[PDB]
Design a binder for this molecule. Structure first.
Ligand SMILES: *Cc1c(COP(=O)(O)O)cnc(C)c1O
Ligand SMILES: *Cc1c(COP(=O)(O)O)cnc(C)c1O
Ligand SMILES: *Cc1c(COP(=O)(O)O)cnc(C)c1O
Ligand SMILES: *Cc1c(COP(=O)(O)O)cnc(C)c1O
Lengths: 450, 444, 446, 450
């Protein structure tokens, strides 16, 4: 099996197929993987649709003109789900491979709008920055490094478990390109209060004239809030929310390879970033980092919109949230645990050990992670971001297909693991590491990217 | 079919399936599409492999630890195909969705290396630029716009049909982050002479101290040159070639969604861009893993000889069409050499003066028989030349080439019977632009 | 790839598969082919049914006795759709590969009935003829040549856009074996008025005693009229309609390979043509043939029923009416008929517009081909040979959205053609009074 | 269970699928069906090829231009297999649904050529006839009835087991349109001696000037003789053989729906029957009774030509013929049986009861047929055509896939059946029918059609 160089000659297809097969099987049962956000199941019709589109190159507008139009209609639907006030029927948005590229497009657009303002004012524009919670996902560090834009982080505390508007404004100045609240903080599952941030930013912008906008990183929540919390003002209903991004392959219910970013209107997307055509009466604007890319995920997204509709999406996310609330409530009743938040607003949540319990416990949540691994679960344990770095938490994500029976299966295994861990005569290795104030490698993938 | 808003209720899967089906069929027969570069066929085993990996998230290293390793082995293979001198077994490279993201990573790395030099020297670093031929593909304009880096374009002429080293150095200065020669220029099919650029850049860098490097945009040629022109020094064998990018889904023979970028060594990838656990570089996080399996399948199934046979057959059929086009009275080829499985031709100047038609009329004639053969004008200083381009991908047989040549001869016979000039023929005399219409992958 | 002789040795199956694959792909997108009448889509269950029956030989009645019965039940259903008055449970009909063989069986039956009468009367029977509109499909020319029967053609005019009964009777005589009205004229989409022909034929046959019958070529309309025009008397409700034929693979909604012919009763099928054995009469030109199309037809009857067939043809006719109405609103065009009775229709250029235009409908065809459409243009049959027309067929699956896509491309093409400085090649051919080669397949067969 | 009228409303597809399924299953095991000539197996690639082509209408030459060419290349290959002397690259032939339509096209062509001669001579042309063996298949009677052409039959005898040339000539006159020898007589498996008929016809035509030609009905033998008997002169090498027809779906090894007819040259196909076109440099002459028809069978035939080649076809028919000779030899060794012929030249043959044995036997070959039916076999018994109507024969056809093991399985059941029938105390019903001269219903399909 070639490690360094290409084989000199060919091998038969049957042998090559097995050789690749032998390195691509899952390490554990994916249905017991509670660490990932990403969709792993679509129905037979969606899968057949996307498998047959494996050879469709999305960028060829002459061969597949109506797939370009269908991309524009998905953008319309997402933008109207987020209550875009734009008057054109064809809304301003871009397809992406994930929230990663969608966030960067939002950040680049905010940066170019800021450069244009400061130039028109005669102010310097060489040291831009943006403001974000320490609970950011790694893509914002990629954005900071690849564009050389300073990242200013607002710490989490037990009194301010999400981005606090007052503390975010203390880090803003004439060089701030935007503030980034997160809907579905990957580390905590909570939503930054966008409406409170908008209220604070409006008063701050009138006092300063800096006109600092908001980009909402809604990788998870972007497909939860419109269906379950329609009255929560977090989107384009707010004055300073100029762009929003989301992962289509997390709670949009599509196989990996899908993200969306929308802008409040065409005038918040700088001219440098877009090229526009008129393909079959539509208004198709071309934005993005890629050229050639697979088109299958567009078909999957459009299939889901038609197959589920608003009510269909609402029932799926509702069932995920109910089972999450159920696990969240049962965890709270167990002596060792306390929840990070009393509210479950996305189908994920975190808990940690009560301080008084951890003091005398001979185990840590890393040992609980290992106990569950022995039964096939992936339930990640990790430390929280800055100012809460001493808190080891455990996170459960409830995706579509995770039934009430499987939730009782998980709670049964947690109770049995606690019964073993509580009878330990001596501290575990990770328990002693905490006593010595030595870091513990997180090991298990948790989507944070850190 | 919802245009603006999500439907309120659900519809049965069978109905929703047909509704999407009714909007995803090709407008023409893809096997007659000679405009596209991208692979459209893999064998049944590769297709089954990639279809089963539709639900595999590549970034989950706990669930699929060996797919991360398999990605690293593909990088080793590509980097060793390009004669990387790095001594570590695990070469420095990145998976990408295409040449687009791979080129940007190369450009961003060059920009960060340049910023690091100029800071350590006390020189300004706010007005970077890079040098490229006017035959660039649209991703380099995106790179210029999205990072606000000045693009300096070297024009094409009939004496310098590719990037000329002497003219490229006339646009370099202390603010130039790199020079980008292209292997497989999308508009012409030719290769910029990288070795001559390296020979010139070494003399210029010794005289100035600017240390301007080379990034090779080898989207097409990156999977052609190692197999058919092994003795052509264009890759990491050259002193100043620090990074190379390629499209895996063009002549790497993989379904759409694959690109590669490699660096000469770990020390040319800035610290800001990479962390190692296997180095994690790139613009994406979650992404489909199917294309990694497809590439690795092809490396094992074909090997060096298998890849060589596939690219050889493509190049031979291209040379065959190229040779038959040259024998027809209206046509003259842009180059006497076919080095990638694509080439362009135009109307002989003496013939065009009295002809009642243009190559746009030939394009329409071929469209009426189902072909997609694009016609367009060349980039700067050759903007007056309307050319036609044919790309020969795997599966385009000798029989289909004669089918194409037969239809070209039949169309020429029709166009020569014209009583009056065509609309586009009058457009040329009036000096009015003609909308290109047909996708040609240039992206302008 | 062998052109003249068989290869000497074998090639591996995978290579041979690709070699054949490389010559069987469509030249254009079939979903944009508006020229063809023939079904190209059945649902997954029908397709699985017919694919699994690929190896069933219909003629082996010992191995597949219930497929023979199922063929007889399809004949019953079609014959009852056409209001056959036959009293036997098992109606008289024949499976065919298409309307081609079904029409010939009807014509041969008419010819043998005519020979038998003239023998019993002592009159000659060596110079038979039949009467048909000039809008006939090529199978009737095959029939005329292969049986050496004179074809007498009734011309189309702008006053007589279909078969006119009075002019058809002027071509009848003691040697006429039948008159052939067409339901779904391939060139125009209209229906010959069968009831008027029966009304005229009844008076003519009483005055002469010739007893000239009717065979209805209903290749398209045979699966349209019973569902959308139940009160139109065109079938076995009429005295002189003795046989009817139809294409199962056009608007019967079955994959290629299916046609039906029915007779009003057993006594109108000559003894020479039938052998009987559930009652099963063995009529037809073939012996061994694929059985898949029988299963497909029977599936559609069960899956759709009367209401289901009615909805499918209703949507096709509605979309046809919609395109027909939008074409009429465009300045260059005028419709051949104000009524759309089958899911197809034709239009041509207004005479005043065409006289000064630089383009013809052949140029519009080329414009649409450049966008992937197949929309055929051709000249009409005799007395209307000067008229270039364009035809659209609306088959199952052609949606309202695709109809607007087509109308958008027609409007854009007209805007392009109206910018021409000089006449096109086909426009000059008209000025030179020279014919233009038809080029695009239009199902007429000429 | 609709019998007479169409159902009023729709039913779900799953139910309709089962409803049709319940009426299309074979009455017996098709692999034990030795009565049929028609192919029931192609390999997986051919089957996928033809299943995917179920929706291709062969006649639409604008949509599928090269399938028309591919049809012309199959005609070239078959015509060159039969040693056509035509010099044009594109040979004169027609696709057919089977030998039925291919034979009729040959007969109609002979009839129109004959009408043309008699007109040019001033002789009558109103009472045509043709000459054929009584072992004809039913298509020739259809031809006689549907075109009102007199059929003149040459009887079979024990001295003349095939068409005798001299006795066929005794039925010729100025009104004979052609003589039809059969290669693979459905009732006997033998080949009419075409070369001897040509020798007689040439002498007869020189004495009379009637110019009576030959059409060879080679439904079975047309795909056997060129591969196993290359030196047998039976085809276009003979002066008076002007047309030949064959069944592609019998020993051409294609699923049902394929026949071919070829003419010696363009001048023997009358102008009234053909319309020629030129596509991709190919004279595509369109002749035939059908218009729209399935194209799948064309692809299958061309696949077989490429996949098998000459040697591949030769090996397949060789194994079929070898197994046929093996069964033929074993039947001859059994006491009750005598073979109709000592030579097996097609993969089928017939035998009957020895006259001396039948005289005292209590059973007939109809009882042997019933014995084998009780074990699942279909082995037909029937009486021979005229002058041999007193002989009940049994026929075995050996198609591809019928292995040596299955042949011994068949011979084992025949030996056991003979042992059972020889223990009979009393004559069977069919044995008494023979003595009482009462006809016995044939019942079982034997492909003769009469
Ligand atoms: C073909 C080509 C590309 C391809 O980009 P994708 O992202 O793979 O579509 C990039 N750059 C150049 C110069 C090319 O010629
Ligand atoms: C989950 C998440 C993402 C997802 O990025 P992908 O490219 O879709 O993998 C991005 N940002 C944040 C803050 C997230 O929580
Ligand atoms: C077997 C045979 C046929 C076959 O006819 P199909 O139409 O292919 O079923 C025709 N004629 C003769 C003499 C045969 O023996
Ligand atoms: C359409 C049509 C046919 C169809 O013949 P097939 O054999 O089914 O292709 C026959 N006759 C007429 C008049 C038609 O319009």
């Amino acid at each position: 099996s070639p490690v360094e160089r290409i084989p000199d000659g060919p091998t038969t297809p049957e042998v090559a197929y097995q050789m690749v097969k032998d390195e691509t099987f899952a390490q554990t049962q994916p249905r017991l993987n509670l660490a990932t956000f990403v969709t792993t199941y679509m129905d037979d019709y969606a899968t057949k649709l996307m498998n047959e589109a494996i050879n469709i190159n999305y960028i060829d507008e002459t061969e597949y003109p109506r797939i370009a139009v269908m991309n524009g209609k998905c953008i319309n639907i997402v933008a109207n789900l987020w209550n875009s006030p734009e008057k054109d029927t064809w809304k301003t948005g871009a397809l992406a491979i994930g929230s990663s590229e969608a966030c960067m497009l939002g950040g680049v657009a905010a940066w170019l709008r800021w450069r244009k303002k400061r130039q028109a004012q005669g102010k310097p524009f060489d040291k831009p920055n943006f403001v974000i919670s320490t609970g950011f996902q790694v893509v914002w560090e990629k954005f900071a490094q690849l564009w050389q834009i300073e990242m200013r982080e607002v710490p989490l505390t037990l009194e301010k478990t999400t981005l606090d508007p007052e503390e975010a404004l203390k880090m803003c100045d004439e060089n701030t390109i935007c503030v980034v609240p997160i809907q579905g903080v990957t580390w905590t599952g909570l939503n930054d209060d966008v409406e409170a941030l908008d209220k604070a930013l409006d008063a701050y912008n009138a006092k300063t004239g800096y006109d600092i906008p908001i980009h909402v990183d809604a990788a998870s929540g972007g497909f939860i809030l419109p269906f379950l919390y329609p009255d929560t003002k977090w989107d384009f209903r707010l004055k300073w929310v100029l762009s929003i991004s989301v992962s289509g392959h997390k709670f949009g219910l599509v196989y990996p390879g899908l993200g969306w970013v929308c802008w409040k209107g065409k005038e918040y997307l700088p001219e440098e970033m877009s090229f526009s055509v008129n393909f079959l009466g539509a208004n198709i604007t071309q934005v993005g980092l890629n050229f050639s890319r697979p088109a299958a995920q567009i078909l999957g997204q459009y299939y889901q919109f038609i197959r589920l509709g608003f009510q269909g999406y609402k029932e799926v996310q509702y069932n995920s949230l109910q089972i999450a609330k159920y696990i969240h409530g049962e965890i709270a009743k167990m002596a060792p645990f306390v929840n990070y938040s009393e509210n479950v607003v996305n189908p994920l949540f975190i808990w940690y050990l009560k301080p008084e319990y951890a003091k005398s416990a001979k185990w840590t949540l890393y040992d609980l992670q290992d106990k569950l691994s022995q039964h096939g679960w992936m339930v990640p344990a990790y430390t929280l971001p800055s100012k809460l770095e001493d808190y080891v938490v455990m996170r459960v994500v409830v995706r579509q297909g995770f039934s009430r029976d499987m939730a009782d299966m998980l709670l049964g295994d947690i109770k049995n693991a606690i019964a073993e861990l509580e009878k330990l005569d001596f501290p575990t290795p990770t328990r002693m590491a905490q006593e010595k104030n030595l870091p513990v490698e997180a090991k298990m993938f948790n989507h944070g990217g850190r």
